[PDB]
Amino acid sequence: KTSFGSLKDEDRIFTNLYGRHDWRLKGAQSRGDWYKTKEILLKGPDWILGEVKTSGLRGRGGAGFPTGLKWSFMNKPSDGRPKYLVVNADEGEPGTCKDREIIRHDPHKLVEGCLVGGRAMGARAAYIYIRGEFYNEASNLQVAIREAYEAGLIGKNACGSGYDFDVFVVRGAGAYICGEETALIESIEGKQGKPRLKPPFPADVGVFGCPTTVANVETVAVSPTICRRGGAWFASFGRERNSGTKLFNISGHVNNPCTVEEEMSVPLKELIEKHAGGVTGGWDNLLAVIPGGSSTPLIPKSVCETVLMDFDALIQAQTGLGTAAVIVMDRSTDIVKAIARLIEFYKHESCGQCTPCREGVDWMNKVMARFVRGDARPAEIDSLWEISKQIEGHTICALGDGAAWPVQGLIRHFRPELEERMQRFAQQHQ
Amino acid sequence: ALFVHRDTPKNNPETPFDFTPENYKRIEAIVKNYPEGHKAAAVLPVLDLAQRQNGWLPISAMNKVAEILQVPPMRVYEVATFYTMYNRKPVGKYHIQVCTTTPCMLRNSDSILEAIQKKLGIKVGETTPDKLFTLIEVECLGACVNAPMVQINDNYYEDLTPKDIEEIIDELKAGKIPKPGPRSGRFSCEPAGGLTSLTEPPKGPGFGVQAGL
Amino acid sequence: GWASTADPLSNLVLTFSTKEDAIAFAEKNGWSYDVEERKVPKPKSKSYGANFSWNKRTRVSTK
Numbered sequence: 001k002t003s004f005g006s007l008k009d010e011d012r013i014f015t016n017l018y019g020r021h022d023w024r025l026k027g028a029q030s031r032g033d034w035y036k037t038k039e040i041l042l043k044g045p046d047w048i049l050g051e052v053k054t055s056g057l058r059g060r061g062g063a064g065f066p067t068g069l070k071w072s073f074m075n076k077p078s079d080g081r082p083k084y085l086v087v088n089a090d091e092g093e094p095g096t097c098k099d100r101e102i103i104r105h106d107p108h109k110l111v112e113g114c115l116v117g118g119r120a121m122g123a124r125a126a127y128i129y130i131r132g133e134f135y136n137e138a139s140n141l142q143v144a145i146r147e148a149y150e151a152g153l154i155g156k157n158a159c160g161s162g163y164d165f166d167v168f169v170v171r172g173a174g175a176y177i178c179g180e181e182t183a184l185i186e187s188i189e190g191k192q193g194k195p196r197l198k199p200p201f202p203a204d205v206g207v208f209g210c211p212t213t214v215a216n217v218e219t220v221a222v223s224p225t226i227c228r229r230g231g232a233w234f235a236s237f238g239r240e241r242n243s244g245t246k247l248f249n250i251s252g253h254v255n256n257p258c259t260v261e262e263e264m265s266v267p268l269k270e271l272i273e274k275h276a277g278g279v280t281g282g283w284d285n286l287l288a289v290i291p292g293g294s295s296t297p298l299i300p301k302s303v304c305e306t307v308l309m310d311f312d313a314l315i316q317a318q319t320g321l322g323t324a325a326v327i328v329m330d331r332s333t334d335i336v337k338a339i340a341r342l343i344e345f346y347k348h349e350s351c352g353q354c355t356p357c358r359e360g361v362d363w364m365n366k367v368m369a370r371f372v373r374g375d376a377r378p379a380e381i382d383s384l385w386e387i388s389k390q391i392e393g394h395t396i397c398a399l400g401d402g403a404a405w406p407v408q409g410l411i412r413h414f415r416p417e418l419e420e421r422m423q424r425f426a427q428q429h430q
Numbered sequence: 431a432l433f434v435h436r437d438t439p440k441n442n443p444e445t446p447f448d449f450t451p452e453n454y455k456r457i458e459a460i461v462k463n464y465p466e467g468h469k470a471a472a473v474l475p476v477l478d479l480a481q482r483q484n485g486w487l488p489i490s491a492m493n494k495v496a497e498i499l500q501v502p503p504m505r506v507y508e509v510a511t512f513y514t515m516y517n518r519k520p521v522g523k524y525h526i527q528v529c530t531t532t533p534c535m536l537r538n539s540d541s542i543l544e545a546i547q548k549k550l551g552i553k554v555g556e557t558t559p560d561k562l563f564t565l566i567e568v569e570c571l572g573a574c575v576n577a578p579m580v581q582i583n584d585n586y587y588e589d590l591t592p593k594d595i596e597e598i599i600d601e602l603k604a605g606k607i608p609k610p611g612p613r614s615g616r617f618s619c620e621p622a623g624g625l626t627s628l629t630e631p632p633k634g635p636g637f638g639v640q641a642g643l
Numbered sequence: 644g645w646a647s648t649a650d651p652l653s654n655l656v657l658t659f660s661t662k663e664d665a666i667a668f669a670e671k672n673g674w675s676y677d678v679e680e681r682k683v684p685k686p687k688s689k690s691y692g693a694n695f696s697w698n699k700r701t702r703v704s705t706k
């Protein structure tokens with residue numbers, strides 16, 4: 001198969017995404033949730049790991065690491081310490097709101113995914129680190145957790161299989177840096193949300209020093225569907241190493257901003273034209289598209305015509321897939337102002353532990369503010385580029401790369417715009 | 431935005447603070463949610479619980495939380511200063527937060543901002559004279575397809591225009607509680623031009639289950 | 644009020660590669676000497692994971 005997109009409603013995993021049906025236990029049980037879970041629990045961790053590594057499912061958090069291998073390093077015999085699965089439900093990234101709808105509208109899918117994942121690695125309990133601002137979603141998840149506890153699906157003798165598993169909900173306190181897995185692990189333990197250094201990986205030393213696997217909501221909620229329908233069913237979509245379905249949040253300067261599931265290798269132009277209703281002012285009014293939120297660099301209209309929205313066709317397009325969050329800017333937008341706002345967001349969300357981010361993100365914010373005001377010279381611009389090259393790869397966590405990438409993308413794609421802005425400032429005020 | 435504390439008669443270590451007995455039971459449940467030997471994790475929820483006692487954190491809840499969990503108070507100070515959702519100053523009853531990140535900036539969140547500023551007669555980070563509102567500016571809050579959006583207390587008011595946020599402010603001043611939802615025609619996340627996807631009824635259990643399971 | 648002195652050898656520091664060369668230069672010129680052994684610091688056993696132990700006391704209070 002070579003033509004992707006136009007996903008049929010039968011193959012969509014996330015039914016009741018829009019909340020038109022019941023989100024509680026009885027509504028979810030009539031859609032396919034909690035069905036033959038005890039058979040999977042009896043088949044066990046080797047079968048679950050094989051079925052999730054046959055599908056080719058990667059990490060939907062934004063790094064794209066293979067889920068089978070990542071859940072496979074944790075499978076090892078015990079050394080006296082318990083094992084834990086932790087679900088990253090933070091989404092501090094701008095443009096991304098898919099897991100909010102997953103938690104609010106399909107919480108039992110998340111709980112069943114937690115149970116299947118904890119069976120895969122032999123985890124003792126599950127910790128769900130929801131965002132601090134998401135009070136209603138946390139309460140909905142707690143209601144669904146109590147409803148599953150009442151029916152005997154989890155807790156004592158989970159689903160009639162003899163396995164012990166628990167689920168906990170830990171609210172955040174409004175931090176983007178807590179979305180990072182090691183910083184999330186530290187913030188669970190009651191400390192400041194500052195990321196650790198790998199090694200040690202969380203599979204060896206994680207939360208409370210126990211073995212730990214941190215997985216996204218989107219890659220956890222699809223695990224029972226993978227283990228039930230089959231790995232080849234999930235692998236039948238998309239390209240090779242690009243298998244499955246993906247949730248896209250299209251927003252910005254579009255007619256109908258929305259969250260919609262789609263085939264993993266759908267073209268960007270087809271997705272924008274079909275689901276979002278088109279760019280404001282037509283397709284010819286396009287200026288720039290950010291494919292995966294503020295971490296991923298922007299791409300102009302010249303590349304957006306013939307691009308595919310998977311991992312490989314976007315890393316080859318000098319950008320990244322990220323969280324698959326589409327931000328659309330048309331011709332009536334100041335790109336430098338948008339990038340300056342993104343850098344201001346990155347400097348307002350920075351843990352300040354390690355030196356290069358702590359100094360260089362503020363430096364980039366000041367330089368970008370001077371760029372927006374135009375009070376700068378062209379010779380500074382490449383210097384700003386070098387500043388990004390002194391941040392990427394020299395930081396503890398990947399917020400430094402996620403802050404250096406938009407500046408590099410904006411410079412590389414719109415150096416003439418910046419040069420025109422500063423020369424207009426020079427010829428006007430001087 | 432000062433990260434150091436100066437002793438004032440309003441905010442002193444001798445400020446009266448103590449949890450209610452029902453909050454003591456809730457704190458005990460929070461502590462029992464965590465493994466033994468790692469009680470310090472309970473610093474994160476319980477301190478937030480203290481905020482729900484007052485709406486803000488004087489330096490008497492931090493010392494009390496440090497005392498009931500056997501942790502030094504400087505760790506509680508670190509926790510209260512690292513995160514932005516803990517109020518170390520007395521905020522108003524209705525704390526309004528406006529998201530001005532780029533997916534919300536493209537859909538004119540600054541229009542909402544100047545409408546609120548014109549209506550309430552205050553600026554960003556300023557409290558109303560009757561202590562009913564407090565307007566600040568925050569980063570992204572994870573509802574970017576519903577841009578522009580604001581958050582009041584723990585409720586989300588999304589997809590607003592200036593008229594809707596004016597109506598929300600007049601409803602808050604009257605004492606009623608508005609519905610925490612988008613003010614447009616759509617409900618949660620569907621496109622405004624009709625449901626493009628998920629129009630089929632759900633298949634139900636037993637569909638697509640492979641053999642040998 | 645300057646620091647007056649009468650010691651000609653007040654600012655005489657001599658540099659040697661090894662202890663034996665210094666001791667030979669000392670006994671060559673007829674100077675009584677005191678020799679102090681070199682205090683090499685003891686190597687440690689550093690571990691970043693030790694800050695996140697499960698049942699030990701080496702857990703960091705904060706970071």
Ligand SMILES: NC(=O)C1=CN([C@@H]2O[C@H](COP(=O)(O)OP(=O)(O)OC[C@H]3O[C@@H](n4cnc5c(N)ncnc54)[C@H](O)[C@@H]3O)[C@@H](O)[C@H]2O)C=CC1
Nearest residue numbers: 061062063065073091092093179181201295296322323398
């Ligand atoms: N989803 C969101 O809200 C956001 C997503 N992102 C995206 O996330 C990515 C950055 O996140 P990272 O976790 O730093 O990416 P990546 O470098 O770390 O690693 C992904 C996962 O693989 C694991 N891993 C990698 N090598 C391993 C090994 N040898 N042994 C065991 N485990 C190993 C890591 O522990 C981690 O859990 C970027 O692609 C960025 O665009 C960025 C910001 C927000």
Ligand SMILES: Cc1cc2nc3c(=O)[nH]c(=O)nc-3n(C[C@H](O)[C@H](O)[C@H](O)COP(=O)(O)O)c2cc1C
Nearest residue numbers: 059060061088090091092179180181215216398399
């Ligand atoms: C600054 C920063 C913030 C992150 N925020 C999130 C997040 O909010 N949600 C998420 O799933 N992953 C986030 N990640 C990615 C995680 O490091 C990691 O990929 C995730 O916890 C699990 O990814 P997986 O789906 O491959 O298992 C963030 C990474 C960084 C560097």
Ligand code: SF4
Nearest residue numbers: 351352353354357397
């Ligand atoms: S890159 Fe920034 S946010 Fe990440 S560890 Fe370093 S200082 Fe903290």
Ligand code: FES
Nearest residue numbers: 534570571573574
């Ligand atoms: S950009 Fe405003 S809610 Fe995300």
